Amino acid sequence: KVRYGVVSTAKVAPRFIEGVRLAGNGEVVAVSSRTLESAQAKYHLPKAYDKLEDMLADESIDVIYVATINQDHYKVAKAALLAGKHVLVEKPFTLTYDQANELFALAESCNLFLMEAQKSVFIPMTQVIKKLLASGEIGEVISISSTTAYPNIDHVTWFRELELGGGTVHFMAPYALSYLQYLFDATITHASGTATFPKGQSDSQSKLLLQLSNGVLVDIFLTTRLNLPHEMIIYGTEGRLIIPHFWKTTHAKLVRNDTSARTIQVDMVSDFEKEAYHVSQMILEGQRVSHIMTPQLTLSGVKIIEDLYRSWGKEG
């Protein structure tokens, strides 16, 4: 019932449609992509555009789902708000903390819904992990280690260019930064890192450290240089929780300081379903922000990422 317009034919149009599809809460009615030809008729969308101007002029669309090149997110979300649309922006929300603050302020001015499309905080398994942790299944949490690897990243043709918002921190950090804060309802009190920068290019890979407000020490590795599986391990005083591809997962393994192993699992058709259910509800329910993926959570990730790059002299 809530009508969306999708910006890009990026490979996610279908997943998000498919996801909105199941959410049953709303429909996608419009897509756009420079080629008025491409994305043809098909997913049975009552219309297609080769201009954001044209989709923005469509009075039947309530929300614009923005999945553009990172650096264009700001400009496009700004146009849609100025046009009367609620906006959902694919992570990373914006390149700059100023861009982001502006977006939320403008959305506040105009009284419109504005959320960042996850970073992992809606899938059912996250709620299971969060509750599990809050109830000492692994005692007191001490340390977290996380690795994310995309060795085939050059399938994204602008990834190597910083000005476009390329690099592992830009691309891969948002999931961890919002997930970890959500899991512990914590904030991040220290963030530092190092990176590999080929001459002229964005970061090939990076390692980050965080300290959360609850004391937990986190090390993150984001790489396009190794074939490693995506994996996060949460270490507590009476066990660990091993979470594969945490932002996308139906499962996780709890290993107790022997007493040993239990698999935890959930049902999940779509990693976009619950987030899509939610945007439309806040939408119908007349909300202007999310209480799940809050502006606070969005802004803090944007700031930290910007700060990392500034510390490297890799700003703009």
The answer on 205 and 80 residing in a single domain is no
Domain that holds residue 205: 117-316
Contact 247, 120 (CB under 8 A): yes
The answer on 134 and 274 residing in a single domain is yes
The answer on 49 and 135 residing in a single domain is no
- In the chain, the number of structural domains is 2
Chain centroid, CA 292 distance in Å: 13
CA distance 189 to 146: 18
Tokens matching residue 15: 């997943």
The answer on 55 and 167 residing in a single domain is no
The answer on 136 and 78 residing in a single domain is no
Last residue of a domain, which of 81, 116, 151?
Answer: 116
CATH number of the domain residue 305 falls in: 3.30.360.10
* Distance, first Cα to last Cα, the chain: 42
The experimental method, as deposited, was X-ray
CA distance 228 to 151: 9
The answer on 245 and 191 residing in a single domain is yes
Q: Measured over all CA atoms, what is the biggest interatomic distance in the chain, rounded to whole angstroms?
A: 61
DSSP line for the chain = -EEEEEEB--TTHHHHHHHHHHH-SEEEEEEE-S-SSTT------S-EES-HHHHHT-TT--EEEE-S-GGGHHHHHHHHHHTT-EEEEESS--SSHHHHHHHHHHHHHTT--EEEE-SS-SSHHHHHHHHHHHTTTT-SEEEEEEEEE-TTGGGSTTTT-GGGT-SHHHHHHHHHHHHHHHHTT--EEEEEEEEE--TTS--SEEEEEEEETTS-EEEEEEESSS----EEEEEETTEEEEEESTTS-SEEEEEESSS-EEEEE---S-TTHHHHHHHHHHHHTT-SS-SSS-HHHHHHHHHHHHHHHHHTT---
Q: What are the residues whose beta carbons fall under 8 Å from the beta carbon of 177, sequence distance 6 or more?
A: 119, 188, 210, 300, 301, 304, 305
Neighbours of 316 (CB within 10 A): 10
CA distance 129 to 233: 12
Neighbours of 5 (CB within 10 A): 26
CA distance 116 to 87: 9
Q: What are the residues whose beta carbons fall under 8 Å from the beta carbon of 18, sequence distance 6 or more?
A: 270, 272
CA torsion angle 87 88 92 94 (round to 10): 10
